[PDB]
Design a protein around this ligand. Sequence first.
Ligand code: HEC
Ligand code: HEC
Length: 190
Amino acid sequence: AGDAEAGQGKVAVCGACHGVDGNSPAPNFPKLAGQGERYLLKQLQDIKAGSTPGAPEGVGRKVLEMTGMLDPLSDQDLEDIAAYFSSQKGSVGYADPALAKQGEKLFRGGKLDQGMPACTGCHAPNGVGNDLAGFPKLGGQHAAYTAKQLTDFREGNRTNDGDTMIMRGVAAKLSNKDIEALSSYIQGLH
Ligand code: HEC
Ligand code: HEC
């Protein structure tokens, strides 16, 4: 576990994009505020490994917008940063019913015809996740971000679910329309 107060001092470069408290309105930059600490730590570690210049291909999580950024930070610094954002208050955004009605049916019901589970079992009915398990909070996340993650899991661009193999398999059954719908619903969910 990290020291949130210490992490508050280690995130100046992050602020422009993620916001000082981890809530920015920038739709492609994920909100970090109130995310589970274990999840954030894993992602920081994975992003650090996959985004360093010369990283071996397919390792970790390669975030182009964060190349080299986490390189000077030690493990404990990443924990402190995770603790800092997890301690912040998340926000909720807009769920357009034209999309979010179908998004809700998918989120709660899955696509059992295609063997795809509902999302609620791991990410909770209100999208708060399960951080003791490391299942991320989704509720309130920017739709464009969420949509990109589901697309990346489906297309094999995001592969840092290897410890569980879960999201690659889930996202494989989602259409572009399904992803748009889910992401809209999730943006307003709490
Ligand atoms: C804008 C140039 C950024 C700066 C500065 C930092 N981050 Fe970032 N972060 C950025 C993007 C575009 C993304 C998403 C990439 C993609 O998949 O589409 C990210 C992602 C993260 C995450 C993952 C969050 C999740 O929900 O899985 C984390 C934990 C993260 N960023 C942390 C982080 C920190 C601690 C930074 C300062 C050291 C930082 N980011 C800067 C864009 C930008
Ligand atoms: C448990 C069996 C799960 C089910 C069913 C679904 N998800 Fe999931 N999801 C799970 C884990 C273990 C992870 C973490 C992978 C990692 O990198 O450690 C996730 C992650 C996501 C994300 C990424 C969130 C982020 O902040 O980047 C998204 C957007 C997500 N999951 C969406 C999602 C949806 C919409 C699902 C139903 C169709 C769903 N997941 C099911 C575990 C599980």
